[PDB]
């Protein structure tokens, strides 16, 4: 380090320079008293939207205002207040006769993109990092409660998935498992943040693997392995067929939430899981329409 | 004072006389990766002046019936210069960007463009029109390269999201009666300290006309649009043989 | 053991209850969090960002959807003609549905605070004109002429080097909070009306286009607040997502 340009170089500066900083704001802003102004050179009402910043005009600079002390709280618009509410994310059916799951067991891939309400709420942001709380409600298709014993097992990726009601994988020597009866109140557990990355991704613009990207492999576009957390498996504890048909519903609630980079909200109807496809022949406007611009 | 500007980096310089200030995305300047955030153990390389410089892409034509175009980063520079060579010789990559868009006309023309940066821009399909087919976009559409791609349904941004809310992202306007350029500075945005430059695109750039271009007969009818961009604080790691894709 | 009694409310499952649940993975430690730009702490931060307001929500055909983001202005006979009108309710069906503020208000029942709308002129450099933009508090009907409209809150806009003007809609209400207004008895929570009139004229020289367009942007002030979170009015699903 003896030449001048290396000494004065700024290469390697790892400190991020921020232009803004956060300030406390427990309530809404107050209003100050203002009077009339008649002068030249000061134009609060004139803006330039081409810059890309929002208008900075206020109430006091446009009309004559009184003094109002505002004490309305802003606590209800925090991320946890918005997100810490349980919602339906999954549903598993175990019929006695049929074709879906006729052998008294089922395997469900963990994803929360199968229902519109939760998906639309969570897709407002790009990255999210949180803990979760899961509740399982089980009953017959008519809502009746019956004396049956069930077992839930969490299967992380790479672990053997059960393939029958008497599979050896049900020994759950290491995998976490829950035994519960239908007559009991719904089961409920806590889940940590388990992604290999620093946050979950609702949108991944890329491909998972290297190589040539032919037409037959286009289904891999947008698939992020960091969001795949495993499988949820359920069975009836017994060596014989059960005597009742059962349905299991799954609800999830977030805790300790953080988010980044908001995005525009969804406009069209959802069609497929983990795919932003839309019907091209049925594009509809965001809101309602009227008959003329000069009438209400 | 705020209408004239000069941008100098590397061995390139850009001058303008009708600027509209500079937007710094999310209020953060680009920076290098810290020791507490890094995970790879090998020493990275920082070519500095040979990669951090202004590059000019192709030129598009603005017409009275245009819809809009988009580009993907850093896919545009994958096959251009020393930056491209470093990108295809290394496994890991991270950098910021500075984007400048030029479009000039006369005092008798009119129109307005919206320039915005949308991180993780995922493209969708029309699902066969009826919405019953699970189709997927082709490779040439997701990573169009340095040529860009023309939008088909600009109202939904080809992804089922309204364009009216695109202003929530870092953006600027090009109003022909006010300015003729737009400048945006974007830091590195990702959930990982490093990532592959060939498989993953960090963000996309959108240029969509909201107010149609108009002029009277006899004026110049050719109104080009040019894109100029420059990496900032580039780092590479994981050296092995060059792969193009 | 310790004697106890069970009270009504046991064994129930309330979706908004905050409690403690048994962990599934003991001694598990998550991945460290690196710095990511653009963190959001409160939803009120997003309510102050301007988005395009669809004043011209007349057309419905597919190829003309993009025209909903602008409305035209041209030369008139100089008699204070009307340009456009719309309602000022942010949570009501209409123009405000295209803004992020309206979508966010769709998740809450009551709101309070001031609003602001910005208009940008996208004509040629040689075009000049003046416009009057008025806000009518609740109770008054839709104005029939400029003379009636000027009696309320208004601003006069002059075209020039600065291509944008801001109209501020101050909070004028009898209650501290307003619910989402609609037709019926709930029109009691209405906000008012906004109208735009020609002040002098739209003037251009020889060789300039005769028509120009105006783009409107809307957001909220710093005293805006919402409460009593609820579900959105519309569900974007018409069957089973599969």
């Amino acid at each position, epitope marked *: 380090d003896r030449v001048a340009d290396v000494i004065e170089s700024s290469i390697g500066d790892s400190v991020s320079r921020a232009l803004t900083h956060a300030l406390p704001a427990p309530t809404g802003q107050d209003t100050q008293v203002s009077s009339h102004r008649l002068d030249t050179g000061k134009v609060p009402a004139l803006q330039a939207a081409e810059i890309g910043a929002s208008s900075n005009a206020s109430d006091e600079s446009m009309i004559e205002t009184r003094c109002v002390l505002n004490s309305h709280s802003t606590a209800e618009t925090t991320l946890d207040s918005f997100f810490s509410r349980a919602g339906l994310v999954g549903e598993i059916d175990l019929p006695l006769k049929g074709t879906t799951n006729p052998n008294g067991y089922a395997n469900w891939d963990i994803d929360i993109t199968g229902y519109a309400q939760m998906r639309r709420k969570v897709e407002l942001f790009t990255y999210m990092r949180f803990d979760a709380e899961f509740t399982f409600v089980a009953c017959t298709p008519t809502g009746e409660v019956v004396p049956q014993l069930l077992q839930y097992m969490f299967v992380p990726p790479g672990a053997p998935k059960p393939d029958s009601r008497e599979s050896l994988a049900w020994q759950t020597a290491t995998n976490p498992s829950v035994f519960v009866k239908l007559s009991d109140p719904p089961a409920q557990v806590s889940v940590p943040f388990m992604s290999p990355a620093s946050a979950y991704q609702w949108f991944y613009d890329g491909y998972p693997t290297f190589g040539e990207h032919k037409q037959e492999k286009d289904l891999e576009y947008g698939a992020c392995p960091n969001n795949m957390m495993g499988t949820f498996s359920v069975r009836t504890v017994g060596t014989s067929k059960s005597k009742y048909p059962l349905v299991v519903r799954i609800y999830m609630r977030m805790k300790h939430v953080r988010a980044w980079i908001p995005r525009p909200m969804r406009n069209q109807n959802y069609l497929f899981k983990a795919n932003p496809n839309y019907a091209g022949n049925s594009i509809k406007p965001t809101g309602t*329409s009227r008959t003329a*611009i000069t009438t209400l | 004072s705020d209408r004239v500007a000069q941008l100098t980096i590397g061995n390139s310089t850009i001058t303008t006389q009708e600027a509209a200030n500079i937007i710094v995305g999310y209020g953060e300047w680009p920076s290098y990766c810290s020791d507490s955030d890094a995970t790879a153990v090998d020493k990275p390389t920082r070519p500095d002046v040979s990669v951090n410089r202004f590059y000019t892409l192709d030129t598009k034509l603005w017409e009275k019936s245009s819809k809009g175009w988009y580009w993907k980063f850093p896919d545009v520079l994958t096959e251009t210069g020393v930056f491209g060579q470093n990108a295809q010789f290394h496994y890991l990559y991270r950098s910021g960007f500075c984007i400048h868009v030029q479009c000039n006309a006369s005092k008798f023309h009119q129109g307005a463009l919206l320039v915005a940066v949308l991180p993780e821009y995922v493209i969708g399909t029309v699902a066969g029109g009826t919405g019953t087919e699970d189709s997927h976009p082709p490779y040439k559409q997701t990573q169009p390269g340095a040529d860009g791609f023309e939008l088909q349904h600009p109202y939904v941004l080809d992804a089922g999201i309204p364009i009216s809310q695109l202003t929530v992202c870092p953006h600027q306007w090009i109003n022909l009666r006010t300015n003729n350029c737009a400048t945006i500075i974007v830091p590195y945005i990702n959930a990982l300290p490093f990532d592959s430059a060939l498989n993953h695109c960090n963000f996309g750039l959108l240029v969509v006309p909201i107010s149609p271009l108009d002029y009277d007969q006899g004026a110049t009818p050719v109104i080009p649009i040019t894109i100029t961009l420059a990496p900032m604080c580039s780092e590479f790691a994981g050296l092995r043989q060059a792969v193009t894709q | 053991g310790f004697p106890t009694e069970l009270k009504p409310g046991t064994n129930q499952f309330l979706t908004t209850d905050d409690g403690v649940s048994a962990p599934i993975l003991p001694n598990f430690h998550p991945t460290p969090c690196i710095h990511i730009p653009g963190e959001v702490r409160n939803l009120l931060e997003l309510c102050q960002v301007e988005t395009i307001l669809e004043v*011209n929500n007349v*057309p419905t055909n597919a*190829t*003309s959807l993009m*025209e909903r983001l602008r409305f035209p202005v041209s030369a008139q006979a100089g008699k204070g003609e009307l340009c456009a009108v719309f309602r000022a309710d942010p949570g009501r069906n209409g123009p405000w549905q295209s803004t992020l503020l309206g979508q966010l208000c769709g998740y809450y029942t009551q709101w309070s605070g001031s609003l602001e709308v910005t208009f940008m002129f996208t004509g040629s450099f040689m075009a000049t004109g003046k416009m009057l933009i008025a806000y009518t508090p609740p109770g008054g009907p839709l104005p029939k002429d400029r003379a009636t409209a000027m009696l309320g809150t208004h601003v006069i806009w002059d075209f020039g080097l600065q291509s944008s003007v801001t109209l501020v809609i101050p909070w004028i209400s009898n209650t501290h909070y307003r619910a989402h207004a609609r037709d019926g008895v709930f029109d009691y929570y209405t906000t008012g009306l906004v109208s735009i009139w020609y002040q002098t004229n739209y003037v251009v020289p020889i060789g300039a286009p005769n028509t120009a367009y105006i783009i409107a942007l809307a957001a909220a002030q710093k005293n805006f607040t919402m409460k009593l979170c609820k579900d959105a009015s519309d569900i974007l699903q018409t069957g089973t997502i599969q």
Partner: antibody
Amino acid sequence: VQLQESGPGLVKPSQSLSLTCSVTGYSITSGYYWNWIRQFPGNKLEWMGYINYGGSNFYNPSLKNRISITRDTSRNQFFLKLNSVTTEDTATYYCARGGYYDYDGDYWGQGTTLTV
Amino acid sequence: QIVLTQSPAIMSASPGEKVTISCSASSSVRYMYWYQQKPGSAPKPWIYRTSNLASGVPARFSGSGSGTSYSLTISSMEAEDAATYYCQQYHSYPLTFGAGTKL
């Protein structure tokens, strides 16, 4: 949607022309562009002009200062008027509904013959 | 104004043969549109966006082209599909039509 043209079949030279189109099954204020097109006896087609869903007009520069298109939203009709008709202005006149710089609905009428 | 040139002016073909007509533009356009007109009636849209088939059109029709050159082809010739065809553009106003091809 159905379109029907009507008007005089014979007009003396140097007079004024007026045609009428009636729309059924769709409101002319809900969208689309409504055009006027004529076909000369030599089987040559020429586009004349249009009226917008909101009342905006645009005319062919060759026919400028001689054409005017109006509308009547109450009765759901739009009109075509010509000034100082000459001998060369004889053709079959069609009315069509179109999109904005693209194919959207493109349903044509049946046409009415004019002799001058 | 954009000028469209159609060729050939007149074509004659036998059933089962291959028919191909071309339309050329004086400037680059995004798409090309086609019409069919039987004598005594009004023109009916046939092809839009150079590939999509209009409703009620037999599947033997197809179109292609890019830039300033576009073509319309018929796989098999029948007696029913014999009329005058036009090429029309939506790139800029005023809208212009081709001269027409009689089959």
